[PDB]
Enzyme design. Structure first.
Site, mmCIF file in Angstrom:
data_model
loop_
_atom_site.group_PDB
_atom_site.id
_atom_site.type_symbol
_atom_site.label_atom_id
_atom_site.label_comp_id
_atom_site.label_asym_id
_atom_site.label_seq_id
_atom_site.Cartn_x
_atom_site.Cartn_y
_atom_site.Cartn_z
ATOM 1 N N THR A 1 0.851 -1.221 0.000
ATOM 2 C CA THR A 1 0.000 0.000 0.000
ATOM 3 C C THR A 1 0.875 1.254 0.000
ATOM 4 O O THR A 1 1.819 1.368 0.783
ATOM 5 C CB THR A 1 -0.961 0.007 1.197
ATOM 6 O OG1 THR A 1 -1.925 -1.025 0.988
ATOM 7 C CG2 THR A 1 -1.681 1.325 1.391
ATOM 8 N N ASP A 17 -2.649 3.908 -4.135
ATOM 9 C CA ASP A 17 -2.636 2.809 -5.087
ATOM 10 C C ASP A 17 -3.904 1.983 -4.866
ATOM 11 O O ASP A 17 -4.719 2.330 -4.012
ATOM 12 C CB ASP A 17 -1.355 1.984 -4.951
ATOM 13 C CG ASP A 17 -1.384 0.994 -3.797
ATOM 14 O OD1 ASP A 17 -1.661 1.424 -2.655
ATOM 15 O OD2 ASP A 17 -1.132 -0.199 -4.048
ATOM 16 N N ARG A 19 -3.839 -1.747 -4.948
ATOM 17 C CA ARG A 19 -3.488 -3.148 -4.777
ATOM 18 C C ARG A 19 -3.765 -3.583 -3.341
ATOM 19 O O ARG A 19 -3.404 -2.889 -2.394
ATOM 20 C CB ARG A 19 -2.021 -3.400 -5.145
ATOM 21 C CG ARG A 19 -1.544 -4.812 -4.828
ATOM 22 C CD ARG A 19 -0.096 -5.072 -5.192
ATOM 23 N NE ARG A 19 0.079 -5.198 -6.630
ATOM 24 C CZ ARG A 19 1.223 -5.511 -7.224
ATOM 25 N NH1 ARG A 19 2.307 -5.743 -6.502
ATOM 26 N NH2 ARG A 19 1.278 -5.592 -8.543
ATOM 27 N N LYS A 33 -9.046 2.839 -1.557
ATOM 28 C CA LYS A 33 -8.370 3.094 -0.298
ATOM 29 C C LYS A 33 -8.657 4.505 0.213
ATOM 30 O O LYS A 33 -8.220 4.858 1.306
ATOM 31 C CB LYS A 33 -6.869 2.828 -0.452
ATOM 32 C CG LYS A 33 -6.518 1.397 -0.834
ATOM 33 C CD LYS A 33 -5.039 1.119 -0.861
ATOM 34 C CE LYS A 33 -4.731 -0.260 -1.403
ATOM 35 N NZ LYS A 33 -3.274 -0.508 -1.481
ATOM 36 N N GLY A 47 -2.628 -0.640 6.474
ATOM 37 C CA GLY A 47 -2.680 -1.546 7.612
ATOM 38 C C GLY A 47 -3.700 -2.657 7.386
ATOM 39 O O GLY A 47 -3.896 -3.087 6.252
ATOM 40 N N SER A 129 3.471 0.279 3.078
ATOM 41 C CA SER A 129 4.755 -0.344 2.803
ATOM 42 C C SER A 129 5.539 0.450 1.754
ATOM 43 O O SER A 129 6.760 0.330 1.667
ATOM 44 C CB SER A 129 4.582 -1.791 2.405
ATOM 45 O OG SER A 129 3.657 -1.914 1.333
ATOM 46 N N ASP A 166 7.737 -0.765 -4.495
ATOM 47 C CA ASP A 166 7.211 -1.559 -3.395
ATOM 48 C C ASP A 166 6.408 -2.740 -3.945
ATOM 49 O O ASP A 166 5.478 -2.555 -4.726
ATOM 50 C CB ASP A 166 6.416 -0.686 -2.418
ATOM 51 C CG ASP A 166 5.645 -1.458 -1.359
ATOM 52 O OD1 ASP A 166 6.221 -2.400 -0.769
ATOM 53 O OD2 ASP A 166 4.472 -1.095 -1.108
ATOM 54 N N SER A 169 2.621 -2.678 -3.420
ATOM 55 C CA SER A 169 1.860 -1.632 -4.089
ATOM 56 C C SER A 169 1.786 -1.914 -5.585
ATOM 57 O O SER A 169 2.698 -2.514 -6.151
ATOM 58 C CB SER A 169 2.455 -0.265 -3.833
ATOM 59 O OG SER A 169 2.401 0.060 -2.455
HETATM 60 CL CL LIG Z 1 0.346 -1.219 4.269
HETATM 61 K K LIG Z 2 3.838 -8.771 -10.435
HETATM 62 MG MG LIG Z 3 4.762 -2.664 -6.723
#
Ligand SMILES: [Cl-]
Ligand SMILES: [K+]
Ligand SMILES: [Mg+2]
Ligand SMILES: [Cl-]
Ligand SMILES: [Cl-]
Ligand SMILES: [Cl-]
Ligand SMILES: [Cl-]
Ligand SMILES: [Cl-]
Ligand SMILES: [Cl-]
Ligand SMILES: [Cl-]
Ligand SMILES: [Cl-]
Ligand SMILES: [Cl-]
Ligand SMILES: [Cl-]
Ligand SMILES: [Cl-]
Ligand SMILES: [Cl-]
Ligand SMILES: [Cl-]
Ligand SMILES: [Cl-]
Ligand SMILES: [Cl-]
Ligand SMILES: [Cl-]
Ligand SMILES: [Cl-]
Ligand SMILES: [Cl-]
Ligand SMILES: [Cl-]
Ligand SMILES: [Cl-]
Ligand SMILES: [K+]
Ligand SMILES: [K+]
Ligand SMILES: [Mg+2]
Ligand SMILES: [Mg+2]
Ligand SMILES: [Mg+2]
Ligand SMILES: [Mg+2]
Ligand SMILES: [Mg+2]
Ligand SMILES: [Mg+2]
Lengths: 220, 196, 213, 204, 197, 215, 199, 196, 198
Positions: A1, A17, A19, A33, A47, A129, A166, A169
């Site tokens: 995230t 994002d 994901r 989100k 989280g 993250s 990340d 993400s």
């Molecule tokens: Cl997160």
């Molecule tokens: K991938």
């Molecule tokens: Mg990524």
């Protein structure tokens, strides 16, 4: 995230994002989100997904009760206080990490809220993250009193930095622009990631699967 | 461990259980009974942790009997199985969980014979045959091999005898005698013990 | 407490054809939630007719491939011929087992041609258990790749289908497809797909782009 | 792993004006199969179904406690529940147990009882909802299922094509899972009919 | 974190760095660790940010109500007492080191330490936070009885600057507050404004 | 090393047209304590190769000693053969893997920069023997904070000039100073070109703290 | 895994499933779990795949050297003893092996169970693996020394099949071998799905 | 668990052991032999950890046989018992300890019959009767009750039978058959198995 | 323990407290933590008393033999190197933080830190548990170009401050000045120790 927010000249820009992962597998490619708190206040969540969902829904409905009673537009500080006091009570067991932004009678306000119930009032914040990648962009490029389009570009760059650096993400960038005069919930804002085309078709005819039993129930 | 077995035929259920009560290295009882009569046509077979087994089974027993006294008619086997599961599942996350594994065997006038399997987590499954205990590991495949849905009561007893003989041969525990009972439209019948 | 292992990601795949073998991998090298590089192939040429894919702990992948390269030359020097695909597979089994009590954290697939010019695929667990396969997926996304291969290459669960030989063209389309699908769901698989085709003419490579997120 | 104790797999898939939901049939305790006809998909209306994978005891408890709440809802409101409302009702039930959760992750498949619009979602064990336009999977072979669904799924599939897609996805996925399988049941939900089929499947 | 407060004749000076870390990532580099509790009463916060914010908010509530009931400016000692009661009662559930400093008409400028464990002590000056280890020698050598307000500001700025150089958990800007009868004066030292050695 | 003692933080690297540039601050931290504020974490290996090290500073000094002696040994022969950057990187990989396999690691992550045969070299080696090449590298917190900015620029413009690469490195060092609690505003920059290896320092970044008035 | 073997009048029957798992993931459905040590000796794979394959391949090596040195084939007793002595040195180091050494020597049909725990026992019938308990049930109810060849095949096949039904970690195909006086033969390979149709 | 028993009479030693080889929940062998012939008039009975038992016992066997070949005469039972103890005690604190419990039974021409008990720690005791295993807990008191030093071979066998019947009755493990042997001046004699 | 050394033009000043503790019992209150390694080379010892005594004795041996072979006064850098080699090689078996300070004709007055882990750096230096408390003081007080008398005062003050705050430091202050002309040692006790008000 990767979630982020900036205070610009005329209000707030929130970004995220889309994901959602379960372990190291993508569960949702188009997760939302940026959560509604009130018409003038939104909130990005990182989280524990269930925790951020339920926490924002609760404060949102409490704020509706609040504003129905006062007849006034809610303040960002109220959402902040309500969130932090509840999160503190639960001693970090509710894993909600939130970017709270809105415009009230006293102008634009942006808070970061952590699971243990500490808050920071800041001109820009990142969480998730992917937050260090996003924060790198902010530290590099943030200026006070940015125009609307500049702030949108900066936030989308910050999210993108998270998306590409990340593993937690990915997918799309969502933006939320809040000013005194308007609210632009841009979902999606940009789609940097797309699945490649399929080279072979696996269109199977009727009878390819062997069937043991069949029951048809007609409906009214 | 304790051994339970059930075999459902067309119009009957056959059940058996070992008769040993063990403690450490010794057999303390050789005529133990692991079967509880719930009603005229229902048996509950219960194994597991000491204390928990008799406490749980007798609680269900008295409640099934209370239902009959209150209503003038008995719980069906299916209703009794679900009642049992509700209680065990309700206690699962409480201060008082019951570490018991159960078979419920019954005959309903309208539904025919029924055999239910329940583990200590309180998952309930209807089965044509089922077994509990370490002995089940050695006997379930014999049932899979020889069982047919139309098996007669005579054959069911001999198929049970095959399972019990396998325990004598291959199982490391001394289980010399077994309780045997059958339930049909005429109620619960005590068959001869199978002994070695 | 020091840990001598880390997981570095990567997905490898091999398919055996009548007169060809394919070895494919993604090019991402990961650690934790981070990407080290987007250009790290997991395929290594061993001989003119043998390629090996290696995924897992990158430290061990590097070491093992260097050990194999050395052993190939040593064999050529003492036996006066290049090692066969089968001999490489057998040898690797013993190399992996030599570390039975401190294993190479590696998943290996060998792809190439046997002595009759037919495609051969060999797959290995970290301690050198191995067998010949028709097709095999290994590494991060292997549970995602394998079921579709069983279906499309093995014709599993399919009625009223002629079991046609597998052409190179269909094999190449299957390879691309499974990787694009894996890149959707496995966070470790992405950036690019590197394909090695082994035929009697030699080894040729092809690269296709994957999602960068 | 608590979620792998009983094994199991469920998936839902969206077609043109129809939905599908499928489940394996195994009830096992670790390695040992106990029965081969365990119900994991429960009706929650004429055109709305929930499938639950996870701990077998919790599969049954959540099914029964959700039916309780749904029956009361339908009696009170005098209408059939919309699919999105069932998802919310389930989310609420699961999150009540936030600190001692049910070990089940359900999928929902149905048509809106007035618009007949397709709906599928899944939830985690503490009730985080996820709505998709393609497919949802849940169980011990989630990765195998993702691989098949990503490869096979196409938009606007007719009931016959949707049947084949979810069938092939399930069969080939569970055949790579030791603790899933022993049969597959499939429900196709349409405006005018429900079609229930069991597939010829490996019994190992 | 480094926090510090100094008494002079007619008031107090408070100071803090602005660094908030998660591990060795700086989450907030411009934190405000001097929290007003009343018109002329502040606290400096160190430890868990959750704990000190929650305790500060609660004391603000308690002291505000108390002050209305009595219809008088609150005593600094009362503010300190309210902090001590909470920090002591919940010592097993808190990670909080507080300095309470301010002015009242009865006792003038006062500094109180409420360290972890919830003891309470009045001091001429106080230091706290992880960064305070590094400046014990400095403050012991530099402190002089009868310092003016300007000297207290300088003394505080210097001490914090030294702590900020050595302690990875301290840094950013220096926030200063002077409290007297006439009110509260706040300032920030950033960049070249921060003393260099 | 089972337990690192005095440690250094991030090292950065980026290839440019005609060379490579690396950067590292001059701090040895003892836990959270900024203990030794004037140490160099960059090494000239030979005329074509340079090296920067994160992690245990004692283990770095050991590698400096070993590798320094290795280059002296080779120069004694005067045979017209010299260790390429790629060869040093290979050696380092073997050494780190070897120590890891003995359960006695050298507690370092390293960046090797080089220029040889009109080719820029940039390579990574960690304490477990994980090694690779990339157009830009960043160890430690640099991996999270600097590498995203590095890769962002190299996406829009793969080929950088020396001055462009230098500006980019200074921008990243500023970010690390803002966001890494083990960093220090005193760093070195090392450049390798056809002309050899130059080490500049001590350098500082100018900082902006305007956001302190934005609460 | 399910493997079984039994001595009878006409030699030794050896049978196995073909499934390999990594956790709950099925890695292979085509593992050869009957290992061809030499033309007169078979071994079986249960436990760790690498451990069985490696150590029995090492046994095959030692048995061939023995034949060359002594000008006669090794006995079943001696072959099983070699393997037992090999693995004993490694007790407590986490080797996972359960094997049956099957042959026909001067003492007639031979069958030993050997494991990494250090067990080595001669016997009439054995079953090894996660699925062994289910195979014991079927085999024990059908086994006789005076069984006919086709009856022996059917029993071995059925016992493995029933194991694959109950045991999650057993499946794929049933592979069947017969050790005779002049060496072993491969009898059959039947997919479990095909056997379901039959039974 | 494995069971060993020895009974020394005036001019003979009688020994018996169970014939089960167990693994997990199954008996894998029902005709197992736990007795090792050391010489013409010495038996070593060995139980304990898998691998260790046969490795240790066969090592002692080959060494006792080597002694005979080297010297032209055999070790006495007492010499063999001490040799065994020396080896086991020497390995106790080494990299290769042997987790074995032993009885050694023998007849010497000059000393008469002898029975030795040894545990895995390698404490050696001469005893008129002894037992190893969990079964020993249930049988030692029967021996204490009925044994006299002048017991005849006929009575010893019946006293052994009493112990074995007690295991059938009271012991939780399935031990259906036992090896029985006697040693006297004429060497080692195989008696009939005692079976249930 | 607090240890410290300062370079001036023409030599070095070393200083230490004298407290040795087992837990919070003072086993030795007049410890000598400045150990001579050669004529004009000293080390200040902190950490395990067993470890630093053993390492110091070993280096004295090594440097003494080396010095005879070469027939010259040893370099301070050589002494430091010998400490570093041992402290690095046996870093997993040692609990030693050393300061090496002294004079040689080649480089003059030199101070080297060899902290735990066995890195080596030329610096003034502080070490021991007590040094935490005087980082701010030394950073504020240090001036380039200090005389010998000023270095003695600077060292006495810093140690006194550390000794007040650190329970593991205390007793007397041992001082040593090393120059070409030799070694001058003194002890500060009682009223001689610099005093600061509470
Ligand atoms: Cl997160
Ligand atoms: K991938
Ligand atoms: Mg990524
Ligand atoms: Cl607030
Ligand atoms: Cl409920
Ligand atoms: Cl704060
Ligand atoms: Cl308030
Ligand atoms: Cl404190
Ligand atoms: Cl404090
Ligand atoms: Cl702090
Ligand atoms: Cl900061
Ligand atoms: Cl330094
Ligand atoms: Cl250098
Ligand atoms: Cl096969
Ligand atoms: Cl040989
Ligand atoms: Cl045997
Ligand atoms: Cl197995
Ligand atoms: Cl049969
Ligand atoms: Cl000496
Ligand atoms: Cl130190
Ligand atoms: Cl030190
Ligand atoms: Cl110390
Ligand atoms: Cl003292
Ligand atoms: K700092
Ligand atoms: K003191
Ligand atoms: Mg707390
Ligand atoms: Mg209890
Ligand atoms: Mg399956
Ligand atoms: Mg199976
Ligand atoms: Mg041992
Ligand atoms: Mg020591």
């Amino acid at each position: 995230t990767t979630i982020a927010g900036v205070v610009y000249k005329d209000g707030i820009v929130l970004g995220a994002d889309t994901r959602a992962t379960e372990g190291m597998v993508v569960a949702d490619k188009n997760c939302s989100k940026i959560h509604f708190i009130s018409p003038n206040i939104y909130c990005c969540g990182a989280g524990t997904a269930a925790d951020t969902d339920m926490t924002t829904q609760l404060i949102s409905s409490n704020l509706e009760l609040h504003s129905l009673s006062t007849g006034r537009l809610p303040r960002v500080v109220t959402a902040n206080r309500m969130l932090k006091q509840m999160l503190f009570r639960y001693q970090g067991y509710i894993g909600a990490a939130l970017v709270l932004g809105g415009v009230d009678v006293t102008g634009p306000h942006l808070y970061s809220i952590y699971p243990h119930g500490s808050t920071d009032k800041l001109p820009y914040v990142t969480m998730g993250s992917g937050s260090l990648a996003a924060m790198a962009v902010f530290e590099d490029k943030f200026r006070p009193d940015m125009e609307e389009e500049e702030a949108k570009n900066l936030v989308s760059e910050a999210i993108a930095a998270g998306i590409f650096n990340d593993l937690g993400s990915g997918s799309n960038i969502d933006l939320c622009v809040i000013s005194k005069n308007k609210l632009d919930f841009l979902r999606p804002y940009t789609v940097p990631n797309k699945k490649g085309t399929r080279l072979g078709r696996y269109r199977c005819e009727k009878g390819t699967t062997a069937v043991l039993t069949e029951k048809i129930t007609p409906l009214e | 461990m304790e051994y339970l077995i059930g075999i459902q035929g067309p119009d009957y259920v056959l059940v058996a259980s070992d008769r040993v009560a063990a403690s450490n290295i010794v057999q303390m009882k050789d005529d133990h009974d692991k079967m509880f009569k719930m009603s005229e046509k229902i048996l509950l077979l219960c194994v597991g942790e000491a204390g928990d087994t008799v406490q749980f089974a007798e609680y269900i027993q008295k409640n099934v009997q209370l239902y009959k006294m209150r209503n003038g008619y008995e719980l069906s086997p299916t209703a009794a199985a679900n009642f049992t599961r509700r209680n065990l599942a309700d206690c699962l996350r409480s201060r008082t969980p019951y570490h018991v594994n159960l078979l419920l065997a019954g005959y309903d006038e309208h539904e025919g014979p029924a055999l239910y399997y329940m583990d200590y987590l309180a998952a309930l499954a209807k089965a044509p045959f089922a077994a509990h205990g370490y002995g089940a590991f050695l006997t379930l495949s014999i049932l899979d091999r020889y069982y047919t849905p139309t098996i007669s009561r005579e054959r069911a007893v001999e198929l049970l005898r095959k399972c019990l003989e396998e325990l004598q041969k291959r199982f490391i525990l001394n289980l010399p005698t077994f309780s045997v009972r059958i339930i049909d439209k005429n109620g619960i019948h005590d068959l001869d013990n199978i002994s070695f | 407490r020091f840990s001598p292992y880390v997981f570095n990601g990567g997905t490898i795949l091999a398919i055996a054809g009548e007169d060809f073998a394919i070895v494919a991998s993604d090019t991402r090298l990961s650690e934790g939630f981070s990407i080290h590089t987007r250009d790290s192939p997991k395929c290594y040429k061993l001989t003119d007719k043998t390629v090996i894919g290696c995924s897992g702990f990158h430290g061990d992948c590097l070491t093992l491939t260097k050990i194999i390269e050395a052993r190939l030359k040593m064999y050529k020097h003492s036996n006066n011929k290049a090692m066969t695909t089968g001999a490489i597979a057998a040898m690797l089994s013993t190399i992996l087992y030599s570390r039975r009590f401190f294993p190479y954290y590696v998943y290996n697939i060998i792809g190439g041609l046997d002595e009759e010019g037919k495609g051969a695929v060999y797959s290995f667990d970290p301690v050198g258990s191995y067998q010949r396969d028709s097709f095999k997926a290994g590494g991060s996304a292997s549970a995602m790749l394998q079921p579709l291969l069983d279906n499309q290459v093995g014709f599993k669960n399919m009625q009223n289908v002629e079991h046609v030989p597998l052409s190179l063209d269909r094999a190449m389309r299957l390879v691309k497809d499974v990787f694009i699908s894996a890149a959707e769901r496995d966070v470790y698989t992405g950036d690019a797909l590197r394909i090695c085709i082994v035929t009697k003419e030699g080894i040729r490579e092809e690269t296709v782009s994957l999602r960068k997120d | 792993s608590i979620m792998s104790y009983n094994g199991g797999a469920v998936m839902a898939m969206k077609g043109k004006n129809c939905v599908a939901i499928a489940a394996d049939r195994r009830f096992g305790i670790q390695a040992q199969m106990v029965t081969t006809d365990f119900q994991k998909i429960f009706p929650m209306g004429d055109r709305l179904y929930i499938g639950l994978a996870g701990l077998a005891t919790d599969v049954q408890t959540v099914a029964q406690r959700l039916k309780f709440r749904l029956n009361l809802y339908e009696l009170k409101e005098g209408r059939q529940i919309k699919p999105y409302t069932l998802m919310s009702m389930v989310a609420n039930l699961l999150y009540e147990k936030r600190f001692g959760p049910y070990y089940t992750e359900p999928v929902i498949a149905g048509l809106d009882p007035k618009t007949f619009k397709p709906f599928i979602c899944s939830l985690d064990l503490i009730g985080c909802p996820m709505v998709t336009d393609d497919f949802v999977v849940s169980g011990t072979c989630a990765e195998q299922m993702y691989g098949m669904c990503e490869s096979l799924w196409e938009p606007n599939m007719d009931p016959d094509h949707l049947f084949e897609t979810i069938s092939q996805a399930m069969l080939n996925a569970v055949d790579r899972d030791a603790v899933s399988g022993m049969g597959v049941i499939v429900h196709i939900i349409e405006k005018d009919k429900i079609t229930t089929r069991t597939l010829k499947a490996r019994m190992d | 974190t480094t926090i510090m407060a100094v008494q002079f004749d007619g008031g107090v000076v408070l100071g803090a760095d602005s660094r908030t870390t998660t591990g060795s990532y700086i989450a907030n580099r411009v934190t405000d660790k001097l929290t007003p509790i009343h018109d002329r009463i502040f606290c400096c916060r160190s430890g868990s940010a959750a704990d000190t914010q929650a305790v500060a908010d609660a004391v603000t509530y308690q002291l505000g109500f108390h002050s209305i009931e009595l219809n008088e400016p609150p005593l600094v000692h009362t503010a300190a007492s309210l902090f001590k009661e909470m920090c002591y009662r919940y010592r097993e559930d808190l990670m909080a080191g507080i300095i309470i400093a301010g002015w009242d008409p009865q006792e003038g400028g006062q500094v109180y330490s409420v360290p972890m464990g919830g003891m309470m002590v009045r001091q001429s000056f106080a230091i706290g936070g992880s960064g305070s280890s590094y400046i014990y020698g400095y403050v012991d050598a530099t402190y002089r009885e009868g310092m003016t307000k300007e000297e207290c500001l300088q003394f505080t700025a210097n001490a914090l600057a030294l702590a900020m150089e050595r302690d990875g958990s301290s840094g950013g800007v220096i926030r200063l507050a002077a409290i007297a009868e006439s009110g509260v004066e706040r300032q920030v030292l950033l960049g070249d404004q921060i003393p260099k050695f | 090393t089972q337990n690192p003692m005095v440690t250094g933080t991030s090292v950065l690297g980026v290839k440019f047209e005609g060379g490579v540039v690396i950067a590292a601050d001059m701090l040895g931290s003892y836990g959270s304590l900024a203990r030794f504020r004037n140490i160099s974490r960059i090494m000239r290996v030979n005329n074509s190769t340079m090296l920067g090290a994160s992690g245990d500073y004692a283990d770095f000094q050991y590698l400096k000693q070993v590798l320094g002696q290795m280059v002296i040994d080779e120069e004694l022969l005067g045979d017209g053969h010299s260790y390429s950057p790629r060869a040093i990187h290979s050696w380092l990989t073997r050494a780190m893997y070897s120590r890891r396999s003995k359960m006695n690691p050298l507690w370092n992550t390293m960046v090797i920069g080089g220029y040889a045969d009109g080719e820029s070299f940039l390579g990574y080696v960690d304490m477990l023997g994980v090694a690779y090449e990339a157009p830009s590298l960043a160890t430690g917190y640099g991996a999270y904070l600097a590498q995203p900015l590095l890769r962002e620029v190299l996406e829009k413009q793969p080929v950088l000039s020396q001055t462009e690469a230098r500006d980019l490195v200074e921008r990243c060092m500023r970010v690390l100073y803002y966001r890494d609690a083990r960093s220090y505003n005193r760093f070195q920059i090392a450049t390798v070109t056809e002309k050899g290896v130059e080490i500049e320092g001590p350098l500082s970044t100018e900082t902006n703290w305007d956001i302190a008035h934005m609460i | 895994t399910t493997t079984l073997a039994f001595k009878f009048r006409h030699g030794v029957i050896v049978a196995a499933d073909s499934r390999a798992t990594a956790g709950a993931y099925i890695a292979s459905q085509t593992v050869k779990k009957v290992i061809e040590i030499n033309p007169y000796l078979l071994g079986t794979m249960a436990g760790g795949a690498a451990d069985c394959s490696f150590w029995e391949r090492l046994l095959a090596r030692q048995c061939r050297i023995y034949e060359l040195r002594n000008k006669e084939r090794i006995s079943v007793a001696a072959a099983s003893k070699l393997l037992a002595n090999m693995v004993y040195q490694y007790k407590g180091m986490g080797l996972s092996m359960g094997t049956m050494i099957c042959g026909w020597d001067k003492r007639g049909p031979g069958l030993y169970y050997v494991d990494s725990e250090g067990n080595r026992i001669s016997g009439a019938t054995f079953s090894v693996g996660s699925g062994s308990v289910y195979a014991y049930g079927v085999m024990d109810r059908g086994y006789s020394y005076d069984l006919e060849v086709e009856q022996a095949y059917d029993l071995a096949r059925r016992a493995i099949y029933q194991a694959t039904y109950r045991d999650a970690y057993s499946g794929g195909a049933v592979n069947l071998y017969h050790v005779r006086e002049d060496g072993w033969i491969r009898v059959s390979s039947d997919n479990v799905a095909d056997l379901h149709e039959k039974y």
